[PDB]
Amino acid sequence: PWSEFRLTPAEAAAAAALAARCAQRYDETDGPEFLLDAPVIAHELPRRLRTFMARARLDAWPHALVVRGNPVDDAALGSTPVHWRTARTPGSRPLSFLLMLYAGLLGDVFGWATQQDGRVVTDVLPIKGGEHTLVSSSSRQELGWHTEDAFSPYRADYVGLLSLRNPDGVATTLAGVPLDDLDERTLDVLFQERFLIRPDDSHLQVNNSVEFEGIAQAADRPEPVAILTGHRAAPHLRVDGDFSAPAEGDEEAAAALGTLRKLIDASLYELVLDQGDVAFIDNRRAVHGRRAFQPRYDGRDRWLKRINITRDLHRSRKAWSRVLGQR
Amino acid sequence: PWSEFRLTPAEAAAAAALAARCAQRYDETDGPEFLLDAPVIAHELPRRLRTFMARARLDAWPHALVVRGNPVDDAALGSTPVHWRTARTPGSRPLSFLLMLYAGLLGDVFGWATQQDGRVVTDVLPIKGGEHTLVSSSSRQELGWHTEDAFSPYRADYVGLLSLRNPDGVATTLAGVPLDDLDERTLDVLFQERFLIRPDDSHLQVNNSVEFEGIAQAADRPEPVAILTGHRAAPHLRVDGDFSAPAEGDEEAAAALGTLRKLIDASLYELVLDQGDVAFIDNRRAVHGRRAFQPRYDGRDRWLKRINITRDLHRSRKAWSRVLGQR
Ligand SMILES: N=C(N)NCC[C@H](O)[C@H](N)C(=O)O
Ligand SMILES: N=C(N)NCC[C@H](O)[C@H](N)C(=O)O
Ligand SMILES: O=C(O)CCC(=O)C(=O)O
Ligand SMILES: O=C(O)CCC(=O)C(=O)O
Ligand SMILES: [Fe+2]
Ligand SMILES: [Fe+2]
């Protein structure tokens, strides 16, 4: 259900070489300079990869675009950081640039003022003491399926994930719209503005080191929104298993959401991002999550770099440029 | 108020050479093959141009992106066609490929099932007998300002225009949102769903050689929509001077539209696309039109190639792929 591309060793080496050169020439991935240049520098990636990204993005069906086979040297990479705060390590620097280059082929990258200190390239790793939380630094508790930043009209079109390491093969989870099982009445209701979607815990002040006011308003006074939009035969999806609810006292909407939860749970499947694998999850066609795992805390924990991507930065003008948020 | 780039002779020659090679290798511009390949082939355009297009698209202010200095040889080009039907002349073929290459740097190109026989690259030229019409083949009557395909939620983000010839320097017209003069109450009303926007005459059966049913429904039963959307301090614009109206009996909406017409008329400015100039008009920030001119009908009339561009083809899934329309 996803579109997959495997780099040849030579293509992977070329891509890595390009990223290393970027790492040499630019101070940081999130600097204004590299943010502007990355989409043009990405034109120098291997042609077969550029072709895959240009075409696969336009296909009607894939839940994600997956690129396998980027080399990662654990010795060069170094130990998995204990927190996202200190996760911009020299060993992980070239791979962060690599992710941004791939991302630039798909759209405009951005971050959130209220998430990991406004960083554009973010980190997914287990944080000691946060095993049973609802955020991506969890481990022992499964990260439930969700549309990324479901609360926001400015949520990403694609979520990019690059696996720096994943020694025990922990699965990312995905599900599309369960169209084979949604009856027309349920479908009709899911297309109506009868649902409340609150911001997830990654946007809380406690999970960072004026935009928090907007988050508080989205949490306190969510306006009713639809779960499905667009074409009945291929709807776009906006839902969060741990932060969605029906509108106050709307039992029809509730029943539709209840049914949707059951169908998504039943159709949820696994994608293992092995070391060096990159996935760009279509945040409109699919929800995603991560399986429960036992963290190590020995320096070799599973570690991903992540980036939010929009097809059009100007659609979020109200929340501006590369770091989004509102009052 | 637009962003301008001038090709050096060498850059222009290189771009032309690239387009000529495409014209040699592909049967047509609108074929599935070239539609898919163009965005990747465009990576081979001159780097300074690719840089301009990548950055200028992300700027907050421009009403259009303008590229000057593509050579056009009138002798090679041949005479201006008498109708769009016969306008895919060998002389104009390389320049059509050139426009599609530039367009591919900005987004996904598409056409309409109900406009110029579903062509993606379309033609703007004066048609004898149609001087006083509301379509782009007019001449003696000014083409009034408009958002392109304002009636449709799937209208282009950018409209690309390449001037094949314009010997008498006829001006394209542009206007942005008149924010310096819209009072808050008027602004509030323009942001509300209190306006009717009907499809323009280019979507009629008479202006072509099941999607016409959708056009008929948009004409007969238009649903109320807003004129302004997005950020109050930089709104997006959706209006058509010859096809917009207030909702039935809504005099407040009417007064807001009346005021907007006056302010747009007063702020309308001119952009002359000389032979070889290309403009990508931001269809969300600006309305555009064309000044009245006396047509020649001697074979050297003003002639443009045109293309519709979206940042995201999947947003129009309901109306699908590269040729849009509904029942
Ligand atoms: N949406 C839920 N349920 N949890 C938040 C997961 C998201 O991926 C969030 N941006 C995070 O990083 O924790
Ligand atoms: N919108 C008005 N008023 N007229 C139609 C002009 C448009 O550019 C139309 N696509 C045309 O080519 O005539
Ligand atoms: O850990 C993963 O594989 C995905 C976690 C996730 O949902 C995210 O980073 O947004
Ligand atoms: O003739 C021009 O310059 C622009 C006409 C126009 O509005 C269009 O082609 O969409
Ligand atoms: Fe997520
Ligand atoms: Fe137009």
Give the CATH level 1 class of chain A. Alpha Beta
Strand count, sense and barrel status of the largest sheet of chain A are:
8 strands, mixed
The biggest chain-chain interface is: A-B, 28 and 28 residues
* Name of the CATH homologous superfamily of chain A: Clavaminate synthase-like
Number of helices of chain A: 8
CATH names the topology of chain A as Double-stranded beta-helix
Enzyme class (chains A, B): oxidoreductase
Binding site for Fe cation (chains A, B): 146, 148, 288
GO cellular component, one term (chains A, B): membrane
Keywords (chains A, B): Antibiotic biosynthesis, Iron, Membrane, Metal-binding, Oxidoreductase, Transmembrane, Transmembrane helix
Q: What does it look like?
A:
Two copies of one chain form a homodimer. Chain A has 327 residues and is of the alpha+beta class. Chain A has a single domain, classed as 4-Layer Sandwich (Double-stranded beta-helix). The first copy, chain A, is 27% helix and 22% strand. Chain A contains eight helices and 16 strands. Chain A has helices spanning 9-25, 32-41, 47-56, 74-77, 93-104, 184-190, 211-220, 251-267; strands at 3-6, 64-68, 108-112, 122-124, 143-146, 158-165, 171-176, 195-197, 228-231, 234-237, 244-246, 269-272, 278-282, 286-290, 303-310, 323-324. In chain A, strands 1, 2, 3, 4, 6, 13, 15 and 16 form an eight-stranded mixed sheet that branches. A four-stranded antiparallel sheet of chain A has the order 5-14-7-12, covered by helices on one side. In chain A, a hairpin with a 2-residue loop joins strand 9 and strand 10. In chain A, helix 1 crosses helix 5 and helix 2 packs across helix 5 (93-104). The radius of gyration of chain A is 19 Å and the shape is globular. Chain A binds chain B through residues 36-37, 39-40, 43, 47, 50-51, 54-55, 58, 60, 108, 157, 230-232, 234, 284, 311-315, 317-318, 320-321, and chain B through 36-37, 39-40, 43, 47, 50-51, 54-55, 58, 60, 108, 157, 230-232, 234, 284, 311-315, 317-318, 320-321. One (2S,3S)-3-hydroxyarginine binds at residues 134-136, 144, 146, 148, 200, 202, 240, 242-243 of chain B. The PDB classes it as oxidoreductase. The entry lists the keywords hydroxylase, oxidoreductase. It forms a dimeric assembly.
